[PDB]
Design a protein around this ligand. Structure first.
Ligand SMILES: *[C@@H]1O[C@H](CO)[C@@H](O[C@@H]2O[C@H](CO)[C@@H](O[C@@H]3O[C@H](CO)[C@@H](O)[C@H](O)[C@@H]3O)[C@H](O)[C@H]2NC(C)=O)[C@H](O)[C@H]1NC(C)=O
Ligand SMILES: CN(c1nc(-c2ccc(F)cc2)cs1)c1c(CCC#N)nc2ccc(C3CCN(S(C)(=O)=O)CC3)nn12
Ligand SMILES: [Ca+2]
Ligand SMILES: [Zn+2]
Ligand SMILES: [Zn+2]
Length: 785
């Protein structure tokens, strides 16, 4: 019945014997003497000079007596105050070229210092506010920011950090959730959240344990002071070889807790930032005191940022919907709606769509949300979602909300918004023997981190949504080397096979061998096809394509548009021209009759006829092998992109290479559909309708070089446009395309990697860059923020 000998014991005792572990307070299951022995606070956490060589008083939180080292309970500043040593922060950066660990240590430990709601811009505050953190940042490896997953809430982001998985895959899709299979709710408060049934994937503490690497308890009851959390970690580090964990985590509820009260830029935020830094100093001083300060890898990382949000900036569904009492809303910086058991999704979406001039939320069916959010493929995600404007909340009705009785809001800051929003970005710093010295790295998504942490511990990662190798540039030593996948399907290269006469495709028109087309239009090699299919490489003066005889359209179409390229028209005489392709059987070709019989569907072209190099070349653009099903509403988007925006990008970027193609993701799992999974065809045909259209736009990062003569790193932007039969998503869509199309595109920006998942292709296979560098490029997201 005693915690004597057991404080913060790693092997938690089962029921009903009392506990002394990190979480016993949250189970109200601590032994009676837990507070007394394990949560001592007398005299604080710092030695003072008058305590140096004191007689030991056992009531003290930490000790300054001469036996403190042998007892394992000196204050973190003991050697500094009592033995004349410097604080860690007062030492200059010193490159740790090799881990310097005690005997017995078989790998450098990892300590994750996680800070809740640590907005990326808080790093600008500087060495006068946060001297310790700024030393970590400038001596170690750091990114300008780290992007969280959506929703930009704590539990989804903490578990992503831990698993490398999107929320829809790990299952923690919100701080609040309903699961229809369990018929149960998950809430930050209450004990439900501890039940293993909610938690999917394989978190780092499980990965370590499964591979024979011990973890400290990552979780801490709120009542355990931060200083005690640190002392506990440090004390665990002095355990014998056969007990000592290799992986630890500190967690702090700051600066999030204050951020909500004062807003992210409230002047009161300086105090929490100072206190966090002091906690960091206690860790580093502690490690130095243990002579582990050149042994341990330390990651400083946040879960998300913080935005200015006040109760007066609240949209109410009751202003849009009658009978708002039929609905359940998960409210705040996002919306999820479901019925209470009158309810009808289409009525609800319509009634919420483009209804007020300044409307600060947009409704979506989850499958129509931007693919970059990867927020749909989980039964815990409601079909109806509201994306809320930064700085705003959505609520169901006024009386569902309440101010203080004094009339002021409960909060001035909040988070949860789209993870592209600047204010939601958080931090990453790595410091120690395995990280690079005084190195800055590009920003990266938090899904990538699990793989790094695995590498840092010599663990094989569980299957996750990180691209393993994409952050090899963070480390001075890599335990993992990325290898480029082998191509599964080889292309055919058909010459002239058929004759005009053999084609009865219902089309009308008013009437190539590699060469240097491959050199000019495919700058980074052919994409590889990573699934079993039959497809043809088709060459033309102005573009190259990979044409699928299964889906009867290109998988990809590649072409290069120079800065000085001329945009021309679709001649009147070629307005409705479609031409048979003599290289492809009639049987594996689309036909024009299908389109005439389909009253909703038209067609467009992947290579734009607007960017033809000559009148003769333009005829290639009307080949049946270049056409794709497009709703008329979609053609408004695509024609504007092709006729106006491609030239613009080319003009701005000193030329661009473009790869465009269809995506099919009818089951919204972010993966390429099998043919069995396609649920819509051009009527009377087996022409599959794309759910989306992608484009990858590449150029030289050094803009002084043209895109087709680039020596160094590359620059990419990409999108995955939803193929919709209306433009209800774009509230200004009844105006000229100049007012809304490019904003639609920006909303549906994507990583090359997202397109790879969605198509089963592999891009950038032949460049003068290292594969690791290419992995970084493929994980880049252009945000426009
Ligand atoms: C993000 O990462 C997760 C985890 O790797 C990915 O989920 C995994 O997806 C695979 C492939 O679909 C699933 O396994 C396979 O499922 C098919 C379909 O039934 C089956 O025929 C195969 O034999 C195999 O079991 C796997 O179950 C699933 N894992 C988890 C944890 O759900 C996910 O696809 C990734 N997301 C993106 C967008 O990349
Ligand atoms: C998810 N979570 C926490 N994640 C971290 C974390 C730290 C560093 C890092 F790189 C990645 C993650 C610390 S704690 C959480 C928190 C809030 C923070 C605290 N303390 N509170 C709790 C309570 C319970 C649990 C569960 C999660 C599920 N399991 S399981 C079944 O997967 O082993 C048990 C403990 N997590 N949790
Ligand atoms: Ca799919
Ligand atoms: Zn948080
Ligand atoms: Zn918060």
């Amino acid at each position: 019945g005693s915690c004597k000998g057991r404080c913060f014991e790693l092997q938690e005792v089962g029921p009903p014997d009392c506990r002394c572990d990190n979480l016993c307070k949250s189970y109200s299951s601590c032994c009676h003497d837990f507070d007394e022995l394990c949560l001592k606070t007398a005299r604080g956490w710092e030695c003072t000079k008058d305590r140096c060589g004191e007689v030991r008083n056992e009531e003290n939180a930490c000790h300054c007596s001469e036996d403190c080292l042998s007892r394992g309970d000196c204050c973190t500043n003991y050697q500094v105050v009592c033995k004349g040593e410097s604080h860690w922060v007062d030492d200059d950066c010193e490159e740790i070229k090799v881990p310097e660990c005690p005997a017995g240590f078989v790998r450098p430990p990892l300590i994750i210092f996680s800070v809740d709601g640590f907005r990326a811009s808080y790093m600008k505050k500087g060495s006068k506010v946060m001297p310790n953190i700024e030393k970590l940042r400038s001596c170690g490896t750091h990114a300008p920011y780290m992007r969280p997953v959506y929703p930009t809430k704590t539990f989804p982001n903490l578990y992503t950090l831990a698993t490398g998985l999107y929320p829809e895959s790990h299952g923690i899709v919100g701080n609040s959730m309903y699961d229809p299979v369990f018929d149960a709710s998950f809430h930050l408060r209450g004990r439900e959240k501890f039940n293993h049934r909610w938690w999917g994937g394989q978190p780092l503490w499980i990965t370590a344990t499964k591979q024979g690497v011990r973890a400290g308890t990552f979780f801490w009851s709120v009542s355990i002071p931060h200083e005690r959390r640190i002392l506990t970690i440090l004390q665990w580090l002095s355990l014998p070889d056969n007990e000592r964990p290799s992986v630890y985590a500190f967690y702090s509820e700051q600066p999030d807790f204050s951020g909500h009260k004062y807003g992210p830029f409230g002047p009161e935020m300086t105090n929490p930032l100072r206190e966090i830094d002091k906690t960091v100093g206690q860790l580093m001083d502690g490690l130095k005191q243990l002579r582990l300060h050149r042994c341990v890898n330390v990651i400083f990382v946040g879960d998300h940022g913080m935005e200015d949000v006040t109760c007066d900036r609240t949209e109410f569904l009751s202003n849009y919907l009658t009978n708002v009492d039929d609905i359940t809303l998960v409210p705040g910086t996002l919306g999820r709606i479901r019925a209470k058991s009158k309810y009808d999704p289409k009525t609800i979406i319509a009634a919420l769509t483009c209804k007020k001039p300044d409307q600060h939320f947009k409704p979506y069916m989850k499958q129509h949300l931007p693919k970059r959010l990867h927020y749909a493929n989980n039964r815990r995600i409601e079909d109806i979602h509201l994306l809320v404007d930064r700085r705003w909340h959505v609520a169901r009705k006024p009386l569902d909300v309440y101010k203080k009785p004094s009339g002021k809001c409960f909060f001035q800051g909040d988070h949860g918004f789209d993870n592209k929003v600047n204010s939601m970005q958080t931090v990453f710093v790595g410091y120690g023997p395995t990280f690079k010295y005084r190195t800055k790295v590009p920003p990266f998504e938090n899904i990538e981190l699990y793989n790094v942490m695995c590498d840092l511990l010599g663990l094989k990662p569980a299957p996750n949504n990180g691209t393993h190798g994409s952050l090899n540039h963070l480390l001075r030593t890599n335990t993992f080397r990325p290898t480029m996948p082998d191509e599964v399907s080889r292309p055919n290269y058909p010459g002239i096979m058929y004759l005009q006469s053999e084609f009865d495709l219902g089309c009308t028109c008013d009437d190539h061998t590699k060469g240097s087309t491959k050199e000019r239009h495919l700058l980074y090699g052919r994409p590889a096809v990573l699934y079993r299919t039959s497809y043809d490489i088709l060459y033309h003066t102005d573009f190259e394509s990979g044409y699928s005889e299964i889906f009867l359209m290109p998988l990809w179409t590649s072409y290069t548009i120079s800065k000085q390229a001329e945009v021309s028209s679709i001649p009147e005489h070629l307005t409705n021209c479609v031409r048979p392709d003599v290289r492809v059987s009639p049987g594996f070709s689309q036909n024009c009759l299908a389109y005439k019989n389909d009253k909703q569907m038209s067609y467009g072209f992947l290579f734009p006829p607007y960017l033809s190099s000559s009148p003769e070349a333009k005829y290639d653009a009307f080949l049946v092998t270049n056409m794709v099903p497009m709703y008329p509403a979609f053609k408004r988007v695509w024609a504007y992109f092709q006729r106006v925006l491609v030239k613009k990008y080319a003009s701005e970027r000193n030329g661009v290479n473009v790869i465009s193609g269809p995506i099919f993701d009818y089951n919204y799992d972010g993966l390429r559909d099998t043919e069995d999974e396609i649920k819509q065809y051009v009527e009377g045909s087996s022409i599959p309708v794309p759910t989306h259209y992608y484009s990858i736009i590449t150029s030289c990062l050094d803009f002084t070089q043209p895109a087709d003569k680039c020596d160094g790193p590359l620059s990419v932007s990409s999108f995955i446009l939803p193929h919709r039969p209306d433009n209800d998503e774009s509230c200004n869509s009844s105006e000229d395309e100049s007012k809304w199309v490019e904003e639609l595109m920006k909303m549906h920006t994507a990583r090359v990697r997202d397109i790879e998942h969605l198509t089963g292709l592999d891009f950038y296979r032949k460049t003068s860059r290292s594969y690791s560098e290419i992995l970084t490029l493929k994980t880049y997201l252009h945000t426009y923020e």
